[PDB]
Design an enzyme around this catalytic site. Structure first.
Site, PDB file in Angstrom:
ATOM      1  N   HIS A 145       0.836  -1.193   0.000  1.00  0.00           N
ATOM      2  CA  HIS A 145       0.000   0.000   0.000  1.00  0.00           C
ATOM      3  C   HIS A 145       0.873   1.246   0.000  1.00  0.00           C
ATOM      4  O   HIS A 145       1.988   1.243   0.529  1.00  0.00           O
ATOM      5  CB  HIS A 145      -0.942   0.030   1.212  1.00  0.00           C
ATOM      6  N   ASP A 171      -8.048  -6.660  -2.556  1.00  0.00           N
ATOM      7  CA  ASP A 171      -8.301  -7.180  -3.896  1.00  0.00           C
ATOM      8  C   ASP A 171      -8.604  -8.674  -3.863  1.00  0.00           C
ATOM      9  O   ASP A 171      -9.538  -9.142  -4.528  1.00  0.00           O
ATOM     10  CB  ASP A 171      -7.101  -6.893  -4.797  1.00  0.00           C
TER      11      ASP A 171
END
Lengths: 371, 370, 371, 365
Positions: free
Chosen positions: B255, B309
């Site tokens: 991230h 995801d």
């Protein structure tokens, strides 16, 4: 150096298209004098130097002409989809939707041809997606054009159905070269804002056509021709000129924020319009406009403004036999080539842009349903 | 003299509609804590807080709900024109080219209270209709007329599936969509603000917004594809070696700033655990769980957690969602920010027209044919 | 605004020592074309016209001949230091570190305007052959002041008396090595020339920067490729492989010249004359074969075999070391740099420029305990 | 524009190393408030952020200390080579030509960016020390093994160990002379940094351009300070030089014009140091007299005045300023070179031809 309400003026990246100096009044298209280029050239090598970066070779020009002729055809299932639309609504929105037409048309090939082919493809295609839409909104069915005419002559015959002389053709070609391109327009600004995302050209062009329209699309030069028609007689324009002076509004077609020393476009427009009015006769509305121009020249002498090219341009549009409300499509047609050259340049940069902002929000609240 | 990259950190405006922390894992949607809102709040209540500014009262909200059900029909001339639509393009590109003229149903260019809520409700309704249409249309299925009886989640599930689903999964999907109702202000939102000032028409606005929603050549999908390609827990060491060679963050891990196990992913993981308890664990679920345990055996100390995801792909697979439009599903969730932005974009009106670093040559000549 | 990035094309000064024109391959040194200037002259007159600018007389010629011949002495402390030098290094770095401390000999203006001139003029080939044989580890071969400059160089570096034709060819090549475009040598020379410290450090920095690109040179890789030719009959396979490689053809291609700079033409003429007079050996035959094979189809690019290819062959005919060609060209390069420094004495002008401050602002220093 | 003889002052590169603001008088070394950084910093992590770019951790500091200690010795063969030099030249040029040969040591030609880097970092001090000892002639010896970097430099230059207060003062002083804007040093360096070869010829050409004409400002500052002399003659000689119409020495910087708060820190530190440690009274008298004498030029006691004072407080060699000058400049030159190497562009500007034409060979010259 951290205060920009409105975010205006911050230069972004490396300009690579045209050299223009508003204070100096210099029009050096990629360093080439715009007047000198337009003096002894045609739009073909112009767009060649614009996107392809240089005026091409003779065999290259002949091949480009033959190819553009080959792709100049029209689609049928498109007309079927086109037959499923009305003929009254907002022409800007109509053309904007008409942009999506090429979407599934060749959507698969997402290269050399991906560069070389799709450019001339969009070139030979967009004029159809515009003019056929105008004919349909007028309730007129399309007609397969003859291939023994110039591209400008092709569009002229499609919208007019007549065989003219080529002097007005060269005039209209220079006119297209006039409103063709400039520095970064807000449309071009948003284009560069989207010219990098590396998705596809078609959706970018569509969003460009969309956001390119300002408030309610339209514009000023159309309103300029409208006010020229509404002028009628200019005998009482002196009282009208005084009332407008008492109205606190900008002089119509006068004083561009950048062009303030009567940029050669306006002067060339006035000279060529005078030549045309001499060759084919001057209109009574043309006489009224000339009288209004003389009255304005004798009126203020303090605004430092000059009769803009729009003065000649609205008159030339009306005399050429053009619908009043179609100006925005012409503006989009001009902007398409500039967007093409810009995206061709932008293909190099793998910049991957991303902004960040400032926060003036609240914090640490407590929600209450049925507030 | 400095031209910062992408104008990173420019004061384009002073946003007061929301906030984000990024350090304590706090996202302020209208200044609201994630868990406190997520406890027992309908998506409509949060939407009213975001758009109406305050959590609306019972009467007005009920009237809006009734009017929504009162306008859930499907146009006939739409299917007529749709007969000419193609059947090859990308499903997201399909949604774009479909919305390419959705606004033509009204060109008032104005009333004030009407075109502050009417076209708003039209947008809030018409999207899932055309979405499920293109879903069946690509399949070449006979169009099904719409009904506003079942809840929007249940109504969409029945429309796309001809099956009435259990509403618990619908509520879970609504909660996930709330976790996905937008991201940080995206390049979509960026170009939107690059167009939001003029307040010309919300139609082309949301249009170009969806257009920009597609990334470079247009998260969950590719991660799920990689997981399916891997399969079971036998390719663990070879995959680890291949990743070490690739020198990239583990697919589904990494991230920009959420290096603290971003709460959206944690909530998605807890919900997925509850669902797998209810719905059972599939062989793919067990294999992926083993793979996740193996990955956590290596990347625990890095402060990197599995991305949402993978969880989203797993939920879509359990929901049996087509791959081609999971991005359109996100757009259905994410584009909700367009309305709140336009409401905020209507507050001010400023024009930006900057210059460019003139990196072009200055003087040349006009060569005729040479 | 605008910034052509980093010293690309901006004209610096209205210098008049030499002139280079690429339209017809024109090299005007003091306005004198190279081809006619090379007929029947000596490098001494060229150096006079370059640095001194005036055509000199035979009396001064004999005087300077006596003086420079008297300036052939070898420093003994230099030899003692060389006894402490290493034994496995780079000849270019060797020459650099060698000349690096000339100040130890001449140390601490109007009269010193020709002393260091003739000093450095004599110094080069001696120290060159010195470091060369120093690598060999043998005892020094003291030169003689009775041999001609080229003849003395050949003898001292080779311990053998040569014949005249090769020496004349070498002088002609030094003339070919004399003048070039605006070189980073001359650039940094003019740069340090504002310091007005000493010509010693000038030549020092000239050697330091004059090194080949990343200690790798066009001529070195050219000789490497010439060796890599190997067989001759398979030229078509290697030609096709390189066509796939799409590199500037090995032994073909400059950065600004495509109109056959006459240096290469004179090199071809001299090479033909030499290979006719001298033994061809397998090298000349294989080279002729490869050259004909290359020239068969490369005419689509309008170039010829590169000079460095012929430089490798010249070094082979001389049996020169690999790194030798570097100082070989550096002789005439620093010779031109001499006239460059001479012109540099004209005016006092020292730059102190700025740049683009591409950085953030308003940072903070955090404690190591915090960090 | 470009048609300006000399072509100086134009922006060249979007550098990311130094940032200054003369009107604001604020100094931010890539975003480092000069005095604020000087409050609680050490030169090690400073250079780490300068070239390496980021603040390191403690384990990295311990490793760097151990490695620098491992790579701190000198070469006996080098010492013998040093004995071969002649003895009539400029000691600064001496140090230059001395460093100009180190290639025979760690030549070679990832990890081949860091080891020789720290080696060259530790190198030049003992080299120039032995060079000075040779110029004198006296034999130097290897340093100690427990001293600080400044302590080692002192126990080398003076062969004796002083206290650490002056050590921290000199630490600030190196930071005081740490860097500046684009100097002609940087311009010439980029001019030579083209092929991004190696530090070897890099620091070489750096020195080769570093010298100025006629063989120093701090040297001239100390010369004028000696010329200041006693108290009574300050006004007479001041008026005599006022009649001479010369640029105000010890003052008047062409570029710097805000009297950088570094100079304020220098004056304060000089005040704090002279208290623990004569002729300083005469110098202060001359300074106050000149200050009361000018009162119009905004020209204040420059850095070199206090630099000569600090050097005398240390008792440095007369021409030794060039040495400390290189000790400051070369590190920044190396950082700029390592940065610019990443460009891979190869500048090649073209000048203006104003020469003659059509000249033929004279048979008689």
């Amino acid at each position: 150096s951290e205060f920009r309400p409105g975010l205006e003026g911050v230069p972004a990246t490396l300009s690579s298209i045209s050299f223009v100096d508003g204070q100096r009044g210099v029009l050096e298209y990629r360093g080439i004098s715009i007047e000198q280029l337009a003096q002894q050239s045609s739009f073909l090598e112009t767009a060649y130097l614009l996107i392809w970066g240089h005026l091409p070779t003779q065999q290259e020009l002949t091949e480009f002409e033959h190819e553009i002729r080959y792709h100049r055809r029209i689609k049928f299932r498109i007309r079927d989809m086109m037959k499923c639309f009305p003929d009254s609504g907002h022409p800007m929105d109509a053309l904007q939707a008409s942009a999506a037409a090429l979407g599934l048309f060749y959507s698969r090939r997402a290269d050399p041809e991906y560069i070389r082919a799709a450019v001339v493809r969009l070139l030979a295609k967009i004029p159809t997606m515009v003019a056929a839409f105008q004919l349909i909104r007028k309730g007129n069915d399309p007609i397969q054009p003859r291939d023994e005419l110039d591209y400008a002559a092709n569009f002229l015959y499609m919208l007019t159905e007549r065989e003219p002389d080529p002097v007005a053709a060269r005039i209209f070609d220079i006119c297209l070269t006039l409103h063709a391109e400039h520095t970064i327009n807000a449309s071009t600004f948003s284009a560069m804002v989207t010219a990098s995302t590396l998705t596809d050209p078609y959706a970018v062009v569509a969003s460009a056509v969309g956001t390119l329209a300002g408030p309610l699309h339209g514009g000023a030069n159309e309103e300029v021709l409208d006010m020229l028609e509404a002028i009628g007689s200019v005998e009482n324009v002196e009282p009208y000129l005084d009332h407008c002076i008492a109205t606190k509004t900008r002089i119509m077609g006068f004083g561009h924020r950048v062009y303030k020393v009567k940029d050669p476009r306006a002067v060339i427009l006035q000279n060529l319009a005078e030549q045309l009015f001499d060759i084919f006769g001057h209109d009574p509305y043309y006489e009224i406009a000339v009288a209004v121009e003389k009255a304005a020249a004798e009126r203020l002498s303090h605004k430092g403004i000059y009769p803009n090219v729009d003065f000649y341009s609205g008159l030339v549009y009306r005399k050429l036999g053009i619908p009043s409300d179609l100006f925005t499509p012409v503006f989009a047609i001009a902007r398409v080539a500039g967007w093409l050259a810009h995206w061709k340049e932008q293909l190099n940069e793998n910049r991957i842009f991303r902004p960040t902002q400032i926060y003036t929000g609240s914090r640490n609240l407590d929600y209450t349903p049925i507030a």
